[PDB]
Amino acid sequence: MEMEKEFEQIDKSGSWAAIYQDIRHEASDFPSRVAKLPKNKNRNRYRDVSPFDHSRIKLHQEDNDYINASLIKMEEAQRSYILTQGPLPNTVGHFWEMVWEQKSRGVVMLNRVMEKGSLKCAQYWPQKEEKEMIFEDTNLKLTLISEDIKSYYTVRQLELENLTTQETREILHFHYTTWPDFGVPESPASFLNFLFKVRESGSLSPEHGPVVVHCSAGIGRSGTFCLADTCLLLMDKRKDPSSVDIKKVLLEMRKFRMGLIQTADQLRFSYLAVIEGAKFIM
Numbered sequence: 001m002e003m004e005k006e007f008e009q010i011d012k013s014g015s016w017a018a019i020y021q022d023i024r025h026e027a028s029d030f031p032s033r034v035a036k037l038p039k040n041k042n043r044n045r046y047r048d049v050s051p052f053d054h055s056r057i058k059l060h061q062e063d064n065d066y067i068n069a070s071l072i073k074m075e076e077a078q079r080s081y082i083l084t085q086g087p088l089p090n091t092v093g094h095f096w097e098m099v100w101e102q103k104s105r106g107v108v109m110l111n112r113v114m115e116k117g118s119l120k121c122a123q124y125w126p127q128k129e130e131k132e133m134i135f136e137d138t139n140l141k142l143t144l145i146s147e148d149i150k151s152y153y154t155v156r157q158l159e160l161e162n163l164t165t166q167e168t169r170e171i172l173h174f175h176y177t178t179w180p181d182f183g184v185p186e187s188p189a190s191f192l193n194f195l196f197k198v199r200e201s202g203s204l205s206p207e208h209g210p211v212v213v214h215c216s217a218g219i220g221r222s223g224t225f226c227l228a229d230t231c232l233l234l235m236d237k238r239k240d241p242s243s244v245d246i247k248k249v250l251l252e253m254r255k256f257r258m259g260l261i262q263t264a265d266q267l268r269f270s271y272l273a274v275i276e277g278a279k280f281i282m
C-alpha cells in the first residue's frame with residue numbers, strides 16, 4: 001500500500017502495536033559473540049543491545065578492537081551510517097578513535113546527557129574553548145572551536161588532533177536537544193528541520209566516511225533518524241515514490257543492527273516524518 005493512506009488505515013483501526021510486533025518477529029537474528037566476551041562487559045551500556053559480529057565497527061588496535069557500534073550500509077539509497085551507543089566513562093577515547101579511523105565528518109546526538117534524572121551518556125566533548133580534552137588511552141586531543149545554540153538543536157565545530165601524527169580534522173557536532181523525556185514529539189517539523197541541517201553540512205555525503213549517530217542505546221531515536229533519511233532519499237531516486245515501503249526499509253536496516261525503532265510510537269512517528277517530509281521536498 002501507499003504510505004499516507006496505510007497510515008490513516010492503521011490509525012483508524014488502532015493496530016500500531018500489531019504492526020510493530022510483526023516487524024519484531026520478522027527481524028534478522030545474527031550472532032554477537034564478540035560483544036558478549038567477558039573482557040567487554042564494561043564496554044556495553046545495556047546487556048540486551050549488542051552489535052552483530054558481521055557488521056560491527058573494529059577499532060584499529062591489536063589489544064582489544066571492540067566498540068558497541070554497527071555499520072548500516074544501504075545499497076540502493078547509496079548511504080551509510082554508523083549507529084552507536086552513547087559513550088561510557090571508559091569508552092570516550094574509543095569513540096573518538098572510531099570517528100578518526102572511519103574518516104567521519106559529523107556526529108549526530110539525539111539525547112541529553114541527563115534525562116529522567118539519570119545519566120544517559122558521558123560528557124564526551126568540551127564545553128569551553130579554553131578547556132580542551134585529551135584522551136590518553138587513544139592519543140587524541142579535542143578542542144571546542146565554536147558553538148551555535150538554537151531553539152531545538154545546537155551545532156558545534158570541534159577540532160580533533162591525532163597526537164601521534166599531529167594531523168588535525170574539523171568535526172561537526174549536531175545535537176538535537178528537545179526530544180521529550182517520555183514518548184515522541186507531537187510534530188515532526190523540528191526533527192525534519194534538523195535532518196536537513198545535517199544534510200546541508202556535507203556530513204552524510206560520499207566524500208566523507210559515514211556519519212556517527214547515537215542516542216543512549218543507539219537503536220531507538222537513532223533508528224528513527226536513519227530510517228527517515230533513507231526513505232526520503234529513495235522517494236527522490238525512484239520513478240514511483242509511492243513504491244517506497246517503510247516497513248521493508250526498516251527490516252533491511254535491522255539486518256545490520258538489532259532493535260532499530262524501540263516502540264510502536266517511534267514507528268508511527270517515523271511514518272509521520274517521512275509523510276510530511278515528502279511534501280516539503282517538492
Ligand SMILES: COc1ccc(NC(=O)Nc2ccncc2)cc1
Pocket residue numbers: 088089090092122134135136
Ligand atoms: C570519562 O572519564 C575520563 C577521565 C579522564 C580521561 N583522561 C584524562 O583526563 N587525561 C588527562 C589529561 C590532562 N590532564 C589530566 C588528565 C578520560 C576520560
Ligand SMILES: COc1ccc(NC(=O)Nc2ccncc2)cc1
Pocket residue numbers: 123124125126127130131132133
Ligand atoms: C566534560 O567535562 C570536561 C572536563 C574537563 C575538560 N577539559 C579540561 O579541563 N581541560 C583543561 C585543559 C587545560 N587546563 C585545564 C583544563 C573538558 C570537559
Ligand SMILES: COc1ccc(NC(=O)Nc2ccncc2)cc1
Pocket residue numbers: 092123124132133134135
Ligand atoms: C573523558 O573526558 C575527559 C577526558 C579528559 C579530560 N581532561 C583533560 O583533558 N585535562 C587536561 C588538562 C590539562 N591539559 C590538557 C588536558 C576531561 C574529560
